[PDB]
Amino acid sequence: KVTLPPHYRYGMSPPGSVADKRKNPPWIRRRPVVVEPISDEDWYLFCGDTVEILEGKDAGKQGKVVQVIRQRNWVVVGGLNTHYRYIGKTMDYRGTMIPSEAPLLHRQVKLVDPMDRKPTEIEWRFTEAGERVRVSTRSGRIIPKPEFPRADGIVPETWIDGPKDTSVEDALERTYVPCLKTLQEEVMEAMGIKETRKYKKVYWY
Amino acid sequence: ARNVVYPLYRLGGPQLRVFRTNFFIQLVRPGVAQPEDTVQFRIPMEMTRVDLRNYLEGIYNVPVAAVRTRVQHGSNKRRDHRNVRIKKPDYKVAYVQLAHGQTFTFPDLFPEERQQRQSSDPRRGGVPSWFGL
Amino acid sequence: GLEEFFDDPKNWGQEKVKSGAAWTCQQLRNKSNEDLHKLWYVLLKERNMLLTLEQEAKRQRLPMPSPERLDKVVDSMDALDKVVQEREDALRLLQTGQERARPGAWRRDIFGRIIWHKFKQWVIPWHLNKRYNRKRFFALPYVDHFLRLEREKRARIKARKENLERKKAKILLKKFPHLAE
Amino acid sequence: AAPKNRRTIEVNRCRRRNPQKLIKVKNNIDVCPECGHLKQKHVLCAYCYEKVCKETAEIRRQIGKQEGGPFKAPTIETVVLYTGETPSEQDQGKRIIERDRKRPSWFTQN
Amino acid sequence: KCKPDKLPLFKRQYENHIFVGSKTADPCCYGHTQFHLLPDKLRRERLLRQNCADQIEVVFRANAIASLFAWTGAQAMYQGFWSEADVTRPFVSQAVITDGKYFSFFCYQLNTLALTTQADQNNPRKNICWGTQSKPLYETIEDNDVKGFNDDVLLQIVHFLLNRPKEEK
Amino acid sequence: TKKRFTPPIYQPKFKTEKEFMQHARKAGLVIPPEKSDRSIHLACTAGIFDAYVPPEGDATERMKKTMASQVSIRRIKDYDANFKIKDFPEKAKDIFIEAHLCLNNSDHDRLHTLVTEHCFPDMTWDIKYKTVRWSFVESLEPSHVVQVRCSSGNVYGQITVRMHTRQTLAIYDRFGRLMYGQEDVPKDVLEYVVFEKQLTNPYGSWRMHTKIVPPWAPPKQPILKTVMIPGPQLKPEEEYEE
Amino acid sequence: EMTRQLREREQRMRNQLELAARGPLRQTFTHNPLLQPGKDKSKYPWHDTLG
Ligand SMILES: [Mg+2]
Ligand SMILES: [Zn+2]
């Protein structure tokens, strides 16, 4: 299951990975990072959502949010605020250089209005149907939650039932008829088992 | 079943029956040579050889001639960074022999760029090669 | 036969095995008890094939193809056991009104702390049992001082925990002074 | 008997760094005319002596495949032959040890 | 292909004994015929409950091979033979194995006694055992009447007891 | 307190990935595959899409190849309307010259904007602890866009450019001693510089990618010092063979 | 023709910011409109027997 020490420092690498284990062994104890408390309800940044960088090496650029870390209030954008690191290095070969992105705090980014490609501040609201949404403060317009592929990787629109995958018509069929009998009693009538012997009473203490 | 209360029995009482069993057994490959008819299992401690027979015959329709069990100790020698001993869970092993001359052999569940790189030239003496001048 | 402990021969050697979703507790509230008693054994046989594959992967020192398969089955086996127990619990409240299937009572142990005693099944009444009457469900007056010492111990712990939380919040404004609101 | 006082680093450097304690340079070193490696004038070349032991061991492994057991030594002489050689005029009635290898240049046939 | 521990067979250390039924001083040192009775644990009806119907006859001829080899081999040791000094003449014996109702007949001949690796390397010859199928002596016993009594089984017991050592001229 | 005991360097032996996984199985080290939606993002391609071979002696079938390049230009103009082909060769000179002046002052922060990630190591790795003095004396012949081709999620466009100009190069070693070249005399150079730009990326730009090395090129300038190329270091048992 | 269908989803999913602008403006209440008209034993049982 999950084995996280009390003051585990979250990072770019996922917990339990080989890189995180070496980085965060069970024994180390480091100063806890201070994170501004943000209500799960208030959080307004999700993966697949365009954001503009206010402060950093490359400010004023808009990019998609590929990853978000709630524990540290980090937002990762592809291709922006990126340094360079050699990947696939070996003892003989230097390795291949690639740009690696650096995490950004939720205060160093700013959401963009779909109508006007400019940074804007949003406040949550409710539509007619009652579904909660985020609306820009200036020139209020709806900003839906960008669709993002599932973590597991399954694409419902491209699913092929296998030999051990129940069909939709068999997994939604209703066969239950509310009664006043237990699985044991109901099964003994169907299987055909008969037991005439009685159960003598015991004492409980 | 495990982690459940068993209804007490008295002379002339009903037969004890379990409709849903939470015993989960795993077939394992023997470490040492065993006869062909013999099969090896790892079962929970609470399980008995009598249950393993009725469990196999009923659920998997396998006739068994003989069943033998042994309890295997798990080393509590390992120690953590706090010098506290770590216990490997003790487990039970079961040896089952098939009845009608059937033979079982464990199946094989796991059947089965670098030359495009250019190196440094000794004659160049370490001079950067990128420069065409 | 013993061929149900392993996966389809063609699947041997593959690194991935596509699998569907896990049964949800709500999808099982529509099936009958007879249908759930049949499904339990379909999942049981799939669970043993996955436990057999998980152990042979360690034997051959290789990674398991799709470990999530076992997690899905374990979640389905627990969800199914939740539905059956739910129907039995509701049926017990109507016929009897009891919230617990096993009898018990609140009692003080020899140490003086409250504990819920779960009864056992016996053939003779409790006043005849040799071994049950050697057990004590009452604390003598030499326990009172330790009960207070143990109560004062929990209070100190609960006090340090509450004072610590206050400190973190007071230290959390020095760096984020815009949290005054 | 225990030290009455602590010995100083100045006293100890004069004892530790006394020329008698120091390692003495060796002047008996020279090059082997065959391989070019270093050697002492009175000691055999480690490199050239090693290649004799590698081949000598292979010859002794072949001898065992002929004897086929202990306490089976012969009462005659022994000869080593390589690919491209036949029993000589003087190597008649001996135990020839066939070697699947070219005769070493340093190994002169006698 | 495996070791005897998988039969199952267990090891122990205790007094080693070579005993024919009496000590060496007893002149009657040659065996004629054994009679064995199978215990209740190996009863036929308990083997059909345990899906071991094919082991019924196995239990019969396993007792003979072990009981008769141990008897004939003990007769030879009394005469001075052992692994290095193998027997010069065969040693034979008989056995009647029964469970109370069914009867089986066996004959064993001890041709060789050299079974060690040092002595079994070049040994050509082997020990022999003959055995029949289990057949009932009686079909049923009701009150004071024995139903379906079989005389062929009784005659076979007599032939064993009738066999005698060849007489000299 | 403040105690950490460190062991000496281990220096793993096997470099290849296969041997690591081949040796991790012998040691029982099981490494389950990763699970993550985030993947890396590469701004430059690894290699050229279509190999270019300049005609020999430059220092029907021919006409068709020139048309194939013209087709690829259209793709480059679908993502950038204000782009002409009679200015890039004049623009490449600025990049080329400006990218080789960052090696003298070690301006790696701006060098990434001029060159790709595939080209940057080749230039800087060897001169990490060396002093370079490169200059552009004069230009002999104008540059020409010889070939333009694009790729078949992202799309990149490569523009091969031919350069023929004089250059001055003097490479000094760690200690300031002359290592290669002469700072006084320039020499003619004929090198085909390849550029790349990630059209999909809205912030992309044209950056140097690599240098085409024709098999018929003259030998490079000789180095100052001498070299010794040892022979096989044989074992005692093994003998030397011609 | 399944592979071709996959490309269409990535096209839109990659660029969703424009789709929102294309959609007509929809009125949104400053506060939840369906929340106001929609919404407008002992923890220590041993004391009951032991004392
Ligand atoms: Mg035992
Ligand atoms: Zn030498």
From Swiss-Prot, chain A:
Which top-level group of life is the source organism from?
Eukaryota
By its UniProt entry, which Gene3D superfamilies does this protein fall under? 2.30.30.30
Q: Which residues carry this modification: Phosphoserine?
A: S13
Compartment list:
Mitochondrion
Q: Any idea which UniProt keywords this protein has?
A: Mitochondrion, Phosphoprotein, Ribonucleoprotein, Ribosomal protein, Transit peptide
**A GO term (biological process) for this protein?**
mitochondrial translation
InterPro entries referenced in this protein's UniProt entry, alphabetically: KOW, Rib_uL2_dom2, Ribosomal_uL24, Ribosomal_uL24_CS, Ribosomal_uL24_KOW, Translation_prot_SH3-like_sf
**Any one GO cellular component localisation term in the record:** mitochondrion
Report the CDD domains cross-referenced here.
KOW_RPL26
Residue ranges constituting the KOW domain according to the UniProt record: 45-78
Show the Pfam families listed in the entry: KOW, ribosomal_L24
Any one GO MF term held by the record is: RNA binding
The family annotation for this protein states: Belongs to the universal ribosomal protein uL24 family.
**SUBUNIT field:** Component of the mitochondrial large ribosomal subunit (mt-LSU). Mature mammalian 55S mitochondrial ribosomes consist of a small (28S) and a large (39S) subunit. The 28S small subunit contains a 12S ribosomal RNA (12S mt-rRNA) and 30 different proteins. The 39S large subunit contains a 16S rRNA (16S mt-rRNA), a copy of mitochondrial valine transfer RNA (mt-tRNA(Val)), which plays an integral structural role, and 52 different proteins.
Q: What is this protein called?
A: Large ribosomal subunit protein uL24m
* Taxonomic lineage: Eukaryota, Metazoa, Chordata, Craniata, Vertebrata
Q: Which gene encodes it?
A: MRPL24
From Swiss-Prot, chain B:
The protein's location, in the record's own words, is: Mitochondrion
An example Gene Ontology molecular-function term: structural constituent of ribosome
Biased segments, Basic and acidic residues type: 113-124
Could you tell me which InterPro entries the record lists for this protein?
Nucleotide-bd_a/b_plait_sf (IPR012677), Ribosomal_uL23-like (IPR013025), Ribosomal_uL23/eL15/eS24_sf (IPR012678)
What GO cellular-component annotations does this UniProt entry give?
fibrillar center; mitochondrial inner membrane; mitochondrial large ribosomal subunit; mitochondrion
Entry keywords, A to Z? Mitochondrion, Ribonucleoprotein, Ribosomal protein
GO term, biological process aspect, one: translation
Q: Note one Pfam family from the annotation.
A: Ribosomal_L23
PANTHER family recorded: LARGE RIBOSOMAL SUBUNIT PROTEIN UL23M, RIBOSOMAL PROTEIN L23-RELATED
Belongs to which family? Belongs to the universal ribosomal protein uL23 family.
Q: How does it assemble?
A: Component of the mitochondrial large ribosomal subunit (mt-LSU). Mature mammalian 55S mitochondrial ribosomes consist of a small (28S) and a large (39S) subunit. The 28S small subunit contains a 12S ribosomal RNA (12S mt-rRNA) and 30 different proteins. The 39S large subunit contains a 16S rRNA (16S mt-rRNA), a copy of mitochondrial valine transfer RNA (mt-tRNA(Val)), which plays an integral structural role, and 52 different proteins.
Recorded protein name is: Large ribosomal subunit protein uL23m
Q: Which organism is it from?
A: Homo sapiens (Human)
Curated annotation (Swiss-Prot), chain D:
Top-rank taxon, per record: Eukaryota
Stretches for region Disordered: 86-110
Q: Which GO terms describe its cellular component?
A: mitochondrial inner membrane; mitochondrial large ribosomal subunit; mitochondrial matrix; mitochondrial ribosome; mitochondrion
Compartment annotation? Mitochondrion
Q: Which residues are Zn(2+)-binding? A: C32, C35, C45, C48
Q: How is this chain modified after translation?
A: MRPL32 precursor is processed by the m-AAA protease (composed of AFG3L2 and SPG7), which cleaves the N-terminal transit peptide. Cleavage by the m-AAA protease takes place prior to assembly into the large subunit, an essential step for mitochondrial ribosome (mitoribosome) assembly. Proper processing by the m-AAA protease is dependent on the zinc-binding region within the tightly folded C-terminal domain of MRPL32: zinc-dependent folding halts degradation initiated from the N-terminus and triggers the release of mature MRPL32.
What keywords appear on the UniProt entry? Mitochondrion, Ribonucleoprotein, Ribosomal protein, Transit peptide
Renumbered to this chain, the Basic and acidic residues biased-composition regions fall at 91-103
Q: Name one GO molecular function term.
A: RNA binding
One GO-annotated biological process of the protein: mitochondrial translation
- Which parts of the chain are coiled coil? none
Purpose: Component of the mitochondrial large ribosomal subunit (mt-LSU). The mitochondrial ribosome (mitoribosome) is a large ribonucleoprotein complex responsible for the synthesis of proteins inside mitochondria.
Regarding protein family, the annotation reads:
Belongs to the bacterial ribosomal protein bL32 family.
Q: Under which name does UniProt file this protein?
A: Large ribosomal subunit protein bL32m
Provide the organism lineage as a comma list: Eukaryota, Metazoa, Chordata, Craniata, Vertebrata
Swiss-Prot record, chain G:
Q: Span of the secretion signal?
A: none
**Chain positions covered by the region annotation Disordered:** 28-51
Which cellular compartments is it found in? Answer: Mitochondrion inner membrane
Residues the record lists as Phosphothreonine modifications = T28, T30
How it assembles, according to the record, is: Monomer; predominantly monomeric at low salt concentrations. Homooligomer; predominantly homooligomeric at high salt concentrations. Associates with the mitochondrial ribosome. Associates preferentially as a dimer with the large ribosomal subunit 39S of the mitochondrial ribosome. Interacts with OXA1L; promoting cotranslational quality control in mitochondria.
Query: What does the UniProt record say this protein does?
Result: Mitochondrial membrane insertase that mediates the cotranslational insertion of integral membrane proteins into the mitochondrial inner membrane. Essential for the activity and assembly of cytochrome oxidase. Required for the correct biogenesis of ATP synthase and complex I in mitochondria.
Which protein family is it in?
Belongs to the OXA1/ALB3/YidC family.
Protein's name in the database? Mitochondrial inner membrane protein OXA1L
| Full-protein interval shown | 373 to 435 of 435
